[PDB]
Design a protein around this ligand. Structure first.
Ligand SMILES: [Zn+2]
Ligand SMILES: [Zn+2]
Ligand SMILES: [Zn+2]
Ligand SMILES: [Zn+2]
Ligand SMILES: [Zn+2]
Ligand SMILES: [Zn+2]
Ligand SMILES: [Zn+2]
Ligand SMILES: [Zn+2]
Ligand SMILES: [Zn+2]
Ligand SMILES: [Zn+2]
Ligand SMILES: [Zn+2]
Ligand SMILES: [Zn+2]
Ligand SMILES: [Zn+2]
Ligand SMILES: [Zn+2]
Lengths: 43, 92, 90, 447, 434, 77, 87, 41
């Protein structure tokens, strides 16, 4: 298929690390905000 | 021949180097102000899209989130990861 | 930068990277967990012993989310979840 | 309105199902907090299908021990193959639904899953926080100016009658309570003790201050600092405290006759007369006690002017009104004095309180005499009845933002001026120039 | 020195004569106070020789029943004729010596004659009032306490502590009138839960403060800093008071205490040859000629070469001139920092000091150290001046949102703008350690 | 030199008044009794010329309280 | 020949009191009493002494000077109007 | 010549002299006890 380099695997490990962290943070914000809207329809 | 990405990740964990990579990355992004900027952006998107749906909100947040990481943090962490890959991976 | 032929052979054997079932994967930690002290995601246990006091109280990401509490219907006190069941047992 | 996962709700209709879910949530979460980094990575953050670590969020299957990654939809695939639609995120213990494609964020039992075992009891006897208190946000009314209180008490402890009641130990002797902490009068005695007898001579005041803010919750003081209201408040404490140390449960006190310092030296009586201009008859004669008089000052330059106005025959309008002969002509009303107090305390009405938060100071100077003669205001030739001015309280500023100063004529004839913690002397010529708010007059001669 | 009528003193040598005069003085004075107007005119104010009424003063003889006028010199004659030199003026009750030609004004014993037969105890046990208090002359913000309370109340470790009802469960006193930490629990009740937001807990808290200590200053000194030390010490005290009988397991000693370490060190073999550890609750740092916080901490962590300490290092067998360095042995979980802007009891440094929303502390700890990062979560600043002092508090809450607390006006405020404040106290919560 | 003759219709020791005094109640030099009972309360406290001279008090050595002359005996014992 | 007989018969008629109090009331309200009190305070300084006899004879004439015509006349007139009655 | 004029005058002087002598009595005595008791005012 295509070339797997030192640069490419490295960027793979970085993206994995970075996408996990984003998805953690967004998960924490979306839920926390869902809770506040269900709990307090007025705001 | 060849799923070396995962095997390379197993070694990084067992050798204790994934922890070092992963912990350096947060240190930086936290200090750099990134994690907070990503929080604001997630809130901003929840607002703009009148939604708290994860799948949809990640869909606009993640790609901006990725760009925001400094050329500094991005460079430095890759050097670190490469320096580790070379102790274990033979070339060409 | 440089193309990759594979993992060094001596590394492959040393770390057994050739190799769980595992639809049992996560449920199998429950034993070590039960004899494992509390752990934080980014508070290195070992650095914590060294630089902080052994008796130290810690709260990870203290402002991550809003205070989790509920209020007593009779006295009106705000109770932390870990305290509710005793408050309610008079 | 926000929704709930219909899928999770479906399974919570069966109580054994409900309890397995929570048991596992607690178990997953417990593991996340009780696993070493290398163990968490390899065993909660490694996809069953692609074996990548951190291929985005790795979910821990809620119905088996599979771990599914996000970035390749390996959990979504697990859920399609085998039917397991729920998963927990190994970075945060948050429960996700792969059919709603969202997290279950807003079910309290799941968020508070460590209480599953007492849940029925918990949601019965406790409640979620109110919108407005949830973050603990609220002001703390700071106690800046108490100069509306200092000032009054300098009158009270330069008042020859009160000094005499205090130095006579009459209260101290009989106070059951017996503590500056709780009893108001003990505070006043301590103020007397510190001032006249022998760290800072502030302690009595501080005790006095504190009883104030407790027994009057939350205000007095810090909404409205009427020096005058604080007068009424104090003299009333003294009366309550006196009535506590009675032998009986006897209604001679509070009226028709108390015998406490306040009622024996400060109380007089007004006589309201409702009279006809037709027949001379007096239909009503009420006689109400007073502890001070309040006088209107608009368009007036002199104290006696203000008194005259208080004494004038009022015209009265009641439409369907019953009188003997002349039921027609409006009823003439007059206030006059029926009994005088040993000390006449007078308030010039300077703080007009208007609609909503609105108010107005009346700064216009009123001429007041070193000796005041009250024959003209008493009820129906009356002898010269002369009082001597011994104290003044004047107020600089505005109804909400302004300052009180006290002035007292001490034994000898020499006037002093009290500004919080700054006692100074002052010429009588010069004290008569002040903008009087509260005048204090001691009986001196009666013919 | 000013002396008394000699004549009355002589008669007083006779303790039995004295008694007689005091008795007569009291008698007149009583008659004077208990006689109807007409009676008084005709019996005390009618001269026995001229028969006139109110011919000036009229003195009642202190030895016979004679009354003598002043105007016609008629008591004088009485005194010259038969030797009666004392007489009492019937208007006031005053006693006049006719040989001195002055009133006997300055003898406490005559003035206070109704305490005649208890005078010995009255001189023993009670004194004349001091010149200073003789007329009772004496005069008589809290924003420096509220500011600190707002930070405590927005502090996740304390909020948790209180909502955990740990103090409630053990306090023997059980009452905010008496108990200070009970006051705190009420603030937390009014603010986060149900009344049944008000000032009851605050009022109660203040009032405990003033009584408790000592009183002192006790409205003073307007030092947010010393109040913070006051609050936290109270907290620890009430933890001790609650037990059934050098470190501590209390809320304060497990979140705010760390340790400075003060080593003497060998230049050559880099070994502590002497080490003194000393706990802290806050760090106090000087901001003189400095621009940002790290430079303050840098200067605090500096090495000094001591000229007074020549010594043998055992470990490397050599003479050294040792080097002293202060540095942190143990970090607290919340690190509280004061910038010294105040000369101690009317001067104030106003330099802006730049402080981060994330502070790394690895460079100030002993033994290389990994990253140790705190999240800023609370500022107190002081506008105005000494005397004119207004403290304002700023706190970060869950969500990243900041809020400003200006004497009971509470308002949202940007992060960007808090970071511009002239910080006096800084409050930092532990966030990441690698 | 004026008409006095009918007026005489109506016609010494100061110590003589002592019994009459004990028959009599507290008097005031210029607060007329009639007027007091008419215009003031019957139980009203009164001090004449209350600023006439310094407050007459003494102070306890053993407690420090300020003491009105008539109060000093009851205090001690 | 005596004048104390007039006086005796004024005290008895209760007109001595009326006069005596009317006098005080007017002096009091004129500020007389107070000006006198000050005059005495003053002379005790400008003569550095507190001897009653001495202070009195520098004060008393001036005291009498200070009583205003208004009050002299009105009281004097009240005395006359009471003299007719009696004698 | 005891006229109404000289009599009225008599009586008024008496009242006025008695009162100057009362006040002066009241105030000298006062300042004496003060200077004695507090030799440093
Ligand atoms: Zn309760
Ligand atoms: Zn599964
Ligand atoms: Zn996967
Ligand atoms: Zn669902
Ligand atoms: Zn009391
Ligand atoms: Zn009463
Ligand atoms: Zn009628
Ligand atoms: Zn003598
Ligand atoms: Zn004579
Ligand atoms: Zn004699
Ligand atoms: Zn308590
Ligand atoms: Zn402690
Ligand atoms: Zn060495
Ligand atoms: Zn005592």
């Amino acid at each position: 298929e295509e070339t797997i380099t030192i640069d490419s695997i490295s960027n793979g490990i970085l993206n994995n690390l970075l996408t996990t962290l984003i998805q953690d943070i967004v998960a924490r914000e979306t839920t926390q905000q869902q809770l506040l809207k269900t709990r307090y329809p007025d705001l | 021949t060849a799923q070396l990405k995962s095997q390379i990740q197993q070694y990084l964990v067992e050798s204790g180097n994934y922890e070092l990579i992963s912990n350096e990355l947060k240190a930086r992004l936290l200090q750099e102000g990134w994690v907070d900027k990503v929080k604001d952006l997630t809130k901003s998107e929840m607002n703009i899209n009148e939604s708290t749906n994860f799948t949809q909100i990640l869909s606009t947040v993640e790609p901006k989130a990725l760009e925001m990481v400094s050329d500094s943090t991005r460079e430095t962490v890759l050097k670190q990861i490469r320096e580790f890959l070379e102790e274990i991976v033979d070339t060409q | 930068d440089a193309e990759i032929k594979g993992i060094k052979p001596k590394v492959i054997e040393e770390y057994s990277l050739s190799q769980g079932p595992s639809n049992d994967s996560w449920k199998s930690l429950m034993s070590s967990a039960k004899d494992t002290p509390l752990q934080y995601d980014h508070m290195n246990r070992e650095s914590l012993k060294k630089y902080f006091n052994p008796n130290a109280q810690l709260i990870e990401d203290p402002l991550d989310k809003p205070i989790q509490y509920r209020v007593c219907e009779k006295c009106g006190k705000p109770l932390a979840l870990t305290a509710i069941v005793d408050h309610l047992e008079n | 309105a926000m929704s709930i996962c219909p899928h999770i709700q479906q399974v919570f209709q069966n109580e054994k199902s409900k309890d397995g879910v929570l048991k596992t949530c607690n178990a997953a979460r417990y593991i996340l907090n009780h696993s070493v980094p290398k163990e968490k990575f390899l065993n909660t953050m490694k996809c069953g299908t692609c074996h990548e670590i951190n291929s985005g969020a790795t979910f821990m299957c809620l119905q088996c021990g599979f771990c599914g990654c996000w970035n390749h939809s390996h959990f979504l695939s697990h859920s399609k193959q085998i039917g397991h639609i729920f998963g927990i995120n190994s970075n945060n213990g948050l429960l996700f639904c792969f059919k709603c494609e969202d997290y279950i964020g807003n079910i309290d039992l799941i968020n508070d899953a460590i209480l599953a075992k007492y849940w029925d009891d918990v949601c019965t006897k406790t409640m979620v926080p109110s919108m407005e208190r949830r973050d603990g946000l609220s002001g703390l009314i700071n106690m800046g100016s108490t100069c509306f209180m200092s000032s009054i008490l300098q009158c009270l402890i330069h008042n020859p009658y009160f000094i005499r009641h205090s130095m006579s130990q009459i209260h101290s002797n009989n106070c059951k309570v017996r503590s500056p902490d709780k009893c108001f009068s003990c505070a006043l005695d301590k103020i007397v003790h510190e001032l006249y007898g022998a760290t800072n001579r502030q302690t009595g005041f501080i005790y006095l201050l504190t009883c104030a803010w407790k027994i009057n919750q939350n205000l007095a003081g810090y909404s409205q600092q009427d020096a005058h209201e604080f007068w009424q408040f104090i003299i009333n404490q003294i009366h309550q405290s006196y009535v506590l140390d009675l032998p009986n449960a006897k209604s001679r006190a509070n009226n028709k006759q108390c015998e406490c310092i306040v009622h024996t030296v400060f109380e007089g009586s007004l006589e309201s007369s409702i009279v006809c201009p037709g027949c001379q008859n007096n239909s009503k004669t009420t006689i109400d006690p007073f502890l001070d008089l309040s006088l209107d000052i608009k368009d007036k330059k002199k104290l006696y002017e203000c008194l005259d106005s208080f004494h004038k025959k009022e015209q009265l309008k009641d439409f369907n009104y019953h009188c003997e002969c002349n039921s027609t002509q409006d009823a003439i009303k007059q206030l006059g004095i029926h009994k005088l107090p040993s000390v006449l305390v007078l308030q010039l009405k300077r703080f007009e309180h208007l609609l909503n938060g609105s108010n107005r100071k009346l700064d216009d100077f009123i001429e007041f005499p070193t000796y005041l003669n009250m024959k003209n205001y008493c009820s129906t030739k009356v002898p010269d009845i002369i009082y001597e001015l011994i104290g003044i309280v004047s107020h600089k500023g505005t109804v909400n933002e302004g300052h009180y100063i006290a002035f007292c004529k001490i034994s000898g004839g020499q006037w002093f001026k009290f500004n919080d913690s700054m006692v100074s002397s002052i010429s009588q010529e010069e004290v008569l120039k002040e903008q009087a708010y509260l005048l204090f007059y001691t009986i001196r001669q009666v013919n």
